[PDB]
Amino acid sequence: IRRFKASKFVFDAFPDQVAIQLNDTHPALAIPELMRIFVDIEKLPWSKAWELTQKTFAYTNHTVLPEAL
Amino acid sequence: ENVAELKKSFNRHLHFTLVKDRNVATTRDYYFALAHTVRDHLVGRWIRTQQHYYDKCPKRVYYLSLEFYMGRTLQNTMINLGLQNACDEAIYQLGLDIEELEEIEEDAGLGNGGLGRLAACFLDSMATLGLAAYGYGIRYEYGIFNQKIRDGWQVEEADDWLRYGNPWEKSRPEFMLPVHFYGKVEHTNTGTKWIDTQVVLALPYDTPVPGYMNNTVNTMRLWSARAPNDYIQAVLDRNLAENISRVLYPNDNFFEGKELRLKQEYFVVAATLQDIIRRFKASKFVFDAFPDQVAIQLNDTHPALAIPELMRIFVDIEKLPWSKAWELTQKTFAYTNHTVLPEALERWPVDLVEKLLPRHLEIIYEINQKHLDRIVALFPKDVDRLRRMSLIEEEGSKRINMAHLCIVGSHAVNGVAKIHSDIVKTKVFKDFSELEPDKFQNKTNGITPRRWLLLCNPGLAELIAEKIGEDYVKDLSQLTKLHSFLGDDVFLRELAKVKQENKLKFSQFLETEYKVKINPSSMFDVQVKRIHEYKRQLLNCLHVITMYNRIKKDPKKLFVPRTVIIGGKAAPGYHMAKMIIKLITSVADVVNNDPMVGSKLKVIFLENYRVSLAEKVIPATDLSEQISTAGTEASGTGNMKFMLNGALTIGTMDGANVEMAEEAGEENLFIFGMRIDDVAALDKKGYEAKEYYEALPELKLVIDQIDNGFFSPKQPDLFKDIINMLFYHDRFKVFADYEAYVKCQDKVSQLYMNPKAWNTMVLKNIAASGKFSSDRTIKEYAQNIWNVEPS
Amino acid sequence: AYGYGIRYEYGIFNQKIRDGWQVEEADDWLRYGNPWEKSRPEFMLPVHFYGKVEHTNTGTKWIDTQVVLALPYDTPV
Amino acid sequence: ENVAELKKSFNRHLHFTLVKDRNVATTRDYYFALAHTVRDHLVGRWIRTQQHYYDKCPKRVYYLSLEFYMGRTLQNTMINLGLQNACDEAIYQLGLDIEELEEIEEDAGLGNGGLGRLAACFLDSMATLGLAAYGYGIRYEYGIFNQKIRDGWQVEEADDWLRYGNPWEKSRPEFMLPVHFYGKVEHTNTGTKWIDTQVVLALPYDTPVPGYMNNTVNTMRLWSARAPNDYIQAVLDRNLAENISRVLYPNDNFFEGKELRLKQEYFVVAATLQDIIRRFKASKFVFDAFPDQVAIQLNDTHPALAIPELMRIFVDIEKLPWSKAWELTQKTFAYTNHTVLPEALERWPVDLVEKLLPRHLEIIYEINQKHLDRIVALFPKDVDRLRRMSLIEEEGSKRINMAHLCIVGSHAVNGVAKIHSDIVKTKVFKDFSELEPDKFQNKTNGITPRRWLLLCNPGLAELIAEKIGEDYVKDLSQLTKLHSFLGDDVFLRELAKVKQENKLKFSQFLETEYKVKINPSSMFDVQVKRIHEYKRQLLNCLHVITMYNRIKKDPKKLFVPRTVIIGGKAAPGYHMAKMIIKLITSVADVVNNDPMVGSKLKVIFLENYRVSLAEKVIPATDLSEQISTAGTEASGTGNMKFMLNGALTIGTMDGANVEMAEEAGEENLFIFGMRIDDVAALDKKGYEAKEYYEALPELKLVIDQIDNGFFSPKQPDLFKDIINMLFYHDRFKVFADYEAYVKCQDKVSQLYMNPKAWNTMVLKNIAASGKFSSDRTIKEYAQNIWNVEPS
Numbered sequence A: 001i002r003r004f005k006a007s008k009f010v011f012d013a014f015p016d017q018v019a020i021q022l023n024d025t026h027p028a029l030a031i032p033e034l035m036r037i038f039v040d041i042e043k044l045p046w047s048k049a050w051e052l053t054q055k056t057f058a059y060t061n062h063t064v065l066p067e068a069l
Numbered sequence B, D: 001e002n003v004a005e006l007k008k009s010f011n012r013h014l015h016f017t018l019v020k021d022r023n024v025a026t027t028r029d030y031y032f033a034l035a036h037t038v039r040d041h042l043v044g045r046w047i048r049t050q051q052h053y054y055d056k057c058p059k060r061v062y063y064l065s066l067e068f069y070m071g072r073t074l075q076n077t078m079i080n081l082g083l084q085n086a087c088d089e090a091i092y093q094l095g096l097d098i099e100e101l102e103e104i105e106e107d108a109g110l111g112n113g114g115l116g117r118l119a120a121c122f123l124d125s126m127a128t129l130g131l132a133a134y135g136y137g138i139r140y141e142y143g144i145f146n147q148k149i150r151d152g153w154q155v156e157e158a159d160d161w162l163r164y165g166n167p168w169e170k171s172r173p174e175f176m177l178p179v180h181f182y183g184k185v186e187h188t189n190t191g192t193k194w195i196d197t198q199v200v201l202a203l204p205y206d207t208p209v210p211g212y213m214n215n216t217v218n219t220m221r222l223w224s225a226r227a228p229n230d231y232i233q234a235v236l237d238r239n240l241a242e243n244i245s246r247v248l249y250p251n252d253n254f255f256e257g258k259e260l261r262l263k264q265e266y267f268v269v270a271a272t273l274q275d276i277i278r279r280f281k282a283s284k285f286v287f288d289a290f291p292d293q294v295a296i297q298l299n300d301t302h303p304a305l306a307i308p309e310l311m312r313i314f315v316d317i318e319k320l321p322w323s324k325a326w327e328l329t330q331k332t333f334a335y336t337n338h339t340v341l342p343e344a345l346e347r348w349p350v351d352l353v354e355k356l357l358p359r360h361l362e363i364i365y366e367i368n369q370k371h372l373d374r375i376v377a378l379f380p381k382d383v384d385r386l387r388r389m390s391l392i393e394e395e396g397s398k399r400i401n402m403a404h405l406c407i408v409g410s411h412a413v414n415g416v417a418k419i420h421s422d423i424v425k426t427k428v429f430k431d432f433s434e435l436e437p438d439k440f441q442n443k444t445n446g447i448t449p450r451r452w453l454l455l456c457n458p459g460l461a462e463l464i465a466e467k468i469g470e471d472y473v474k475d476l477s478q479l480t481k482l483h484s485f486l487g488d489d490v491f492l493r494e495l496a497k498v499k500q501e502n503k504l505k506f507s508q509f510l511e512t513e514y515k516v517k518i519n520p521s522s523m524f525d526v527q528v529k530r531i532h533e534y535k536r537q538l539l540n541c542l543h544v545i546t547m548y549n550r551i552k553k554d555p556k557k558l559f560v561p562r563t564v565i566i567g568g569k570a571a572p573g574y575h576m577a578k579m580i581i582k583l584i585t586s587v588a589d590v591v592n593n594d595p596m597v598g599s600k601l602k603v604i605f606l607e608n609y610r611v612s613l614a615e616k617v618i619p620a621t622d623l624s625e626q627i628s629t630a631g632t633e634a635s636g637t638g639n640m641k642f643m644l645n646g647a648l649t650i651g652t653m654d655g656a657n658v659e660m661a662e663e664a665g666e667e668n669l670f671i672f673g674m675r676i677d678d679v680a681a682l683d684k685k686g687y688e689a690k691e692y693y694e695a696l697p698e699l700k701l702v703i704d705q706i707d708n709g710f711f712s713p714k715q716p717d718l719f720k721d722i723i724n725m726l727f728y729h730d731r732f733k734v735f736a737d738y739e740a741y742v743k744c745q746d747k748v749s750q751l752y753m754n755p756k757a758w759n760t761m762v763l764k765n766i767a768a769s770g771k772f773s774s775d776r777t778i779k780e781y782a783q784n785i786w787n788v789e790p791s
Numbered sequence C: 001a002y003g004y005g006i007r008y009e010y011g012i013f014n015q016k017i018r019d020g021w022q023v024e025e026a027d028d029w030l031r032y033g034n035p036w037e038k039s040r041p042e043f044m045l046p047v048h049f050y051g052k053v054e055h056t057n058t059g060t061k062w063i064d065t066q067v068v069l070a071l072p073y074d075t076p077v
């Protein structure tokens, strides 16, 4: 977000400047964290924040074994 | 609340309220639709807040002022209500540009400058602090005039701010009241009666005042004059009664004894006091508890008549005995002094007052008699002390010294900055403070960080919140936490980036309004405030010409480029201020068009400086000019706005500048020139302007250029009035601070050449600006004067 | 593209075989220094843990948190 | 070497080493680029010097210490290498401020105070004298904590000095060694074996020690602890072995028997001795020549275990017979005693030692047995002599008297100032010196004139060189030549000017860090050292309040204005020292804000006193406070720094103050108070604090103010612990030296009123400071203890 704000490119263009790949679910918290920053801190409305979030993240599943979920 | 519902309301108002659809709706229609959409969000809390004050009955605070320099209301309301982001999104989705809609709104310019803007910041702070406070003033049909520049001179145009309607006001017809004028006094056996008076009605209009994020919505009540009840001529003459609330007197720090101004002062006062007493009698709380339920702050002496008026009501009407009435009165009123300049003192001739307000003249004479009887009893031999402490000056044609009336009728008197409050207490009113030491106080001015940070500079507010949370919004002292980033390189670049963006956005504004091309790389040197000889934009102008000559003498020399901006309105009848404006536009013409200076230096006279423009230019400033002659600016508040927004200050040790230095560290401000005591020394010795002209070669060249027509070729003697004033009548010693000022200015450019050092000083200024929140100022008034408590 | 992860002091353990079984030993890969990493101290950031939520009229606030700093190290690719 | 090449290297390091360019480089990056640029200049000579010691094989000196209070390295390196002027020029040309770059460096604060700083000065001197010397200690991850003051109290913060990297250290992985703990002893037929021990690795880091202008670059080797080789928990538990070299114990002159401290002591000792033996076996010089090739100085008893460890290696490992091993051991070790205060004596309970170091306990018991067998054979009837001379105190729970172990295992024992060395020899260790008269010596402390004159006070160094050449740098006794200028008026003004400049520059520092405004005209009265009851900054505080009352009683009286500065860190668990700090900040608050005193007196508690701050404040001092109770400060070194830098001394006849008086002439110092014998008299008679409180009216008022809450209104009983200690438990007789101290202080102000007389005395102090160069101290150690020769 900090690198985004310095790009001299508010957060509407964020998903056009940023793509974040979640390697398995280990970094899953990134989703609610991006929402927390957009909402609690940047004061963006939830619907807008949720839209930007989905356009930002992509998830890669690496296994179907139950013990690994 | 959310986006979908905001869009729905917007469309609903565009339809039923503006009677339009998307293909015929005007920009103004869209602004009004959004305004009503936002306004609807205030209602519930406005009603609850006022209901709450009636239920729990806390002590109320009434801020009585002839001025309320409110600016625009839309954005301020969205922000304090936490609605801005949602509305921005909704308007964007409707395919509209919210910025354009916001520019449609007229400023409510019901003030001249500092005094009126302080009243506005106080209302925001009192609502944010949850105080049961009310602002009381006049609803002028026309506020401070719109300024135009024609052929280099100021031209005035009527500020018809209500022409298209004000969605932010609510007529309160059921509270209309009659106000009396002229007539005569009759001393009957049933009490003295004031009779055969002319009556003018007072219609109150309420404007909501939202606290920052707290469910509190207070009220600002402004009165409008209306006529009561050859036929045609008689109907047209109704204009005469209505002229009372027609126009704001356009004078800043200057007294003009016009009868109409006297009518306005009594008008606000009479309508206000009656309304207060009426609300008091309905509180289901005889008048013994009045001072425990009411506090009335007199904003300068303009509403001084409130004192004899309260006495008139208690005595002539409520039949209370004088001593009892006088006791309640003093406990009710507190007075705020806003200036020490002689030309600004209110001294009404007794003849005018006798004609317009016969009964008040009698009450004032009575107050004065008891007053002097006391002094005579304490200092029997000091006959001149009586002359000095009287409410009446027989010094020629008798007049009433309104400041003295405010002092004897008030339990507290305060100045607006330490240096000022001290001068008021120990010099100007020495005789009074000596008698009542504890009566005089200080309450350093403040500005609201909502409008002057969150609203006007979202980039900075966000950057700061990023680093230290949002607690600072309601506790500005929290900005000291910013000190942890002094060595933080990345943060310093981020800070500079925010200033750069503000400058870019403002430069766009400048290029479209003015012919000039702006070097966005230049240092923005800014002086915006009312045009005054004491504020000395003339000195600033001397330095500008000085830099000009330097570029002409040695074009290839390394020089930090500047964009010099000077703006402010001159009172219509202030000739010297008008000459000074013409001098600046003339100088700018030469400078901006000399191919040799080019992008090295650009000069701009910022037209129509007012609250909404201040919100644009301040966030874009690097250097803030606060150069009044030591001892002339009681406090200043523009100085504070600039400090809060990332600009460094070049100024004299005057007013609150002194406290900005105490907080940030004198070395983190570019202080210069004579100090209060040096100014006195020069006065004692006698100021000989010619000596500096003689001894300073750069000064002499500037002066000669001005006087010979270098800047006015088509008319060589144009600036003769300035030259003569400068050499023989400069009460503000422009030449005497010239040398130090220019040296100081050179030091500024030096620091500017070092970005990291510059932003390091900026950070220390911002981190130390917390004392200047009006929230702190109000807490002090509540605790030491009104005796009320934040909620 | 940028890779973002954690700079573990110890990576996947070194495996030894003792009497036919796996034995684990600490993988102290940074003991002698890693010339391939470049500390970027100017980009250090605070990360929050624990604390509690407060739903104020200025937005929900997460407070009384414990803070741990995050120091980024860049490795060229 | 020259400017062009230095700039080129700087840019090269900024690029390849910091991976930056001029627009993204941080201040820290620039500091690191310069550091590497300077560091490169050390390499060639570092390699040659160490190669030379291997080739010519001179006898080596190993200074074993738990502390090395090094301060910053950049400037010290540039100076000793003759590179400062060139680097200053190069950095200036690159458009940078070398002063800013220097302030980025963290102090290597691996020491508490005098003891640790002496080790640092010794390294500089040994390198300047060309001795084959090595400093051996621990590389603490965290040094002495950073001190903050919050609400008047000391707050501790971790000193994370290595967070950004230390360019001045060089890991030496190929010399890592294993150190053993716990386990058990087995007495086999192949020699006693120490088994089942836990192992912790010791990784050495070398830091170059440049001699002043001589091509010699010695080494300081500091060891860091590392772990050898549920899985996760096991990995995390590696922290336990690594905690050994984690933090410096923050105690100055105070023993704390924590097991972790015992682990640190054995850790340094074990790693150091092994490394020494290994280097000895590679010298291509069996162990008979060991003492002719090795000298190990024990800095206080902290590294006492080195003795039984050397025995353990010779016996258990090298299989040498005990008698032979014991002989070699004594010839190897020399011990330096640094204090006589009881609370600072190291007495480890035998149980802890038995658990952690079973084999060393056995070796110590053995040493003790042979020791007492001798005494029994010499004084058969003196049974108590045995009790007094034993290495074991059965006085309750058995403990090891480490000082006694250092004495029997060393061939030389020395104190650090004549008065101290005498007390050690004839009183504290009378039984031992009686037996071995020639074993006890004196080696008066010293300070290095590079860091403490050339570096910290360039103005003075230059002025002096101007008059007498530069020979004084390496032969400080040369300062006596300054006596030729006693009547030289011009020189005396030049001297005062240098002090004035230092004061100006330091005042700037004070105003930006503290709210206070500094009267640059005032006398800088300074007391900086660790907060202790024995150093008595409490007495200083009594005098401050005393001057305060005087100004309040008679404001218009002629008074020499002062700026009183007191600074130093309190050990975290030293409650009284923390109360004393709070007392000083409280007093300062009242004083600095009383409008009546104003610029007459300012008080400042100097925060975070450490080596780099000492280099700033000392050169700016006029009056140096050295007021410890007679007989409590073994030597002192701050006293010497102040003398060398142009300050006069107010102090007791204690430690080296006595020798400063011998050299300069007692009348040229403001000596006062009880002397060693008077203190004993009062002890014999019994100290009754109340008597002075009763008899001295100024003292009584001060005390009452403190005890009643004059300085702590919000909490009247705050300073109760101090009052009680002062009246019933003041081991340091604060009240008993109060009268003479204040009288003495008055005499100081008198002299200060006479500039010429003051600077005349200053000149006599500077001209007589030559004896206090650590170069002289080291020559004495080399000649009379290590038997090595300067080169």
Ligand SMILES: O=C(N[C@@H](Cc1ccccc1)C(=O)N1CC(C(=O)O)C1)c1cc2cc(Cl)ccc2[nH]1
Binding pocket: B039, B040, B042, B043, B046, B167, B168, B169, B170, B171, B206, B207, B208
């Ligand atoms: O003027 C408002 N409503 C209007 C509603 C209205 C409009 C037209 C005729 C009668 C009533 C109002 O009360 N009047 C217009 C009339 C006049 O011109 O004097 C009287 C209003 C609603 C409101 C709600 C908030 Cl939160 C703040 C300010 C507000 N003003």
Ligand SMILES: O=C(N[C@@H](Cc1ccccc1)C(=O)N1CC(C(=O)O)C1)c1cc2cc(Cl)ccc2[nH]1
Binding pocket: C035, C036, C037, C038, C039, C074, C075, C076, D016, D017, D018, D019, D032, D163, D164, D165, D166, D167, D168
């Ligand atoms: O660590 C590098 N330089 C070093 C330079 C340095 C060395 C010693 C002390 C301070 C700075 C560095 O920046 N630091 C070591 C410190 C630490 O361990 O925290 C910080 C480095 C340069 C470089 C260049 C490329 Cl292309 C790739 C990786 C790189 N690392």
Ligand SMILES: O=C(N[C@@H](Cc1ccccc1)C(=O)N1CC(C(=O)O)C1)c1cc2cc(Cl)ccc2[nH]1
Binding pocket: C031, C032, C033, C034, C035, D039, D040, D042, D043, D046, D167, D168, D169, D170, D171, D206, D207, D208
């Ligand atoms: O640490 C130096 N060089 C560095 C060089 C280096 C840097 C990164 C990876 C491997 C090697 C060094 O030897 N190491 C950093 C590693 C660690 O973190 O343990 C080991 C160094 C060079 C030098 C030269 C002088 Cl004159 C004085 C002190 C010095 N230190």
Ligand SMILES: *Cc1c(COP(=O)(O)O)cnc(C)c1O
Binding pocket: B112, B113, B114, B117, B528, B529, B530, B609, B610, B611, B614, B635, B636, B637, B638, B639, B641
């Ligand atoms: C704040 C403000 C002022 C007062 O400015 P000073 O420089 O303090 O005189 C005047 N006019 C406007 C529009 C302001 O916002």
Ligand SMILES: *Cc1c(COP(=O)(O)O)cnc(C)c1O
Binding pocket: D112, D113, D114, D117, D528, D529, D530, D609, D610, D611, D614, D635, D636, D637, D638, D639, D641
């Ligand atoms: C020299 C020095 C000391 C020792 O000072 P004394 O006054 O001799 O106790 C302590 N701390 C620092 C940082 C020093 O430089």
Ligand SMILES: CC(=O)N[C@@H]1O[C@H](CO)[C@@H](O)[C@H](O)[C@H]1O
Binding pocket: B113, B114, B115, B118, B252, B253, B254, B300, B338, B339, B344, B416, B445, B633, B634, B635, B636, B637, B655
């Ligand atoms: C009469 C008048 O307008 N006084 C003005 O009041 C404001 C608000 O207190 C001050 O900041 C300013 O210095 C002063 O000139």
Ligand SMILES: CC(=O)N[C@@H]1O[C@H](CO)[C@@H](O)[C@H](O)[C@H]1O
Binding pocket: D113, D114, D115, D118, D252, D253, D254, D300, D338, D339, D344, D416, D445, D633, D634, D635, D636, D637, D655
């Ligand atoms: C235990 C300890 O820190 N002792 C200190 O040693 C230094 C260096 O010898 C002396 O100057 C000082 O007086 C003494 O208090």
Ligand SMILES: Cn1c(=O)c2c(ncn2C)n(C)c1=O
Binding pocket: B251, B252, B253, B254, B343, B532, B571, B572, B573, B574, B575
């Ligand atoms: C400030 N001020 C005015 O505002 C003014 C004036 N004369 C007329 N006006 C309106 N003068 C002389 C003046 O000093």
Ligand SMILES: Cn1c(=O)c2c(ncn2C)n(C)c1=O
Binding pocket: B153, B154, B575, B578, B579
């Ligand atoms: C508009 N205007 C003025 O306002 C003015 C003036 N000369 C003095 N004043 C004030 N002139 C020539 C002028 O054109």
Ligand SMILES: Cn1c(=O)c2c(ncn2C)n(C)c1=O
Binding pocket: C021, C022
């Ligand atoms: C006997 N035994 C086990 O039975 C065992 C083991 N590791 C896992 N198991 C189950 N090891 C190392 C081992 O010696």
Ligand SMILES: Cn1c(=O)c2c(ncn2C)n(C)c1=O
Binding pocket: D251, D252, D253, D254, D343, D532, D571, D572, D573, D574, D575
């Ligand atoms: C010097 N000193 C200390 O350093 C100390 C202490 N108590 C705890 N500490 C740490 N005491 C009583 C003490 O005299």
Ligand SMILES: Cn1c(=O)c2c(ncn2C)n(C)c1=O
Binding pocket: D153, D154, D575, D578, D579
């Ligand atoms: C921080 N601090 C202390 O460090 C302290 C204390 N009382 C005693 N001490 C040591 N108080 C009240 C305190 O706030």
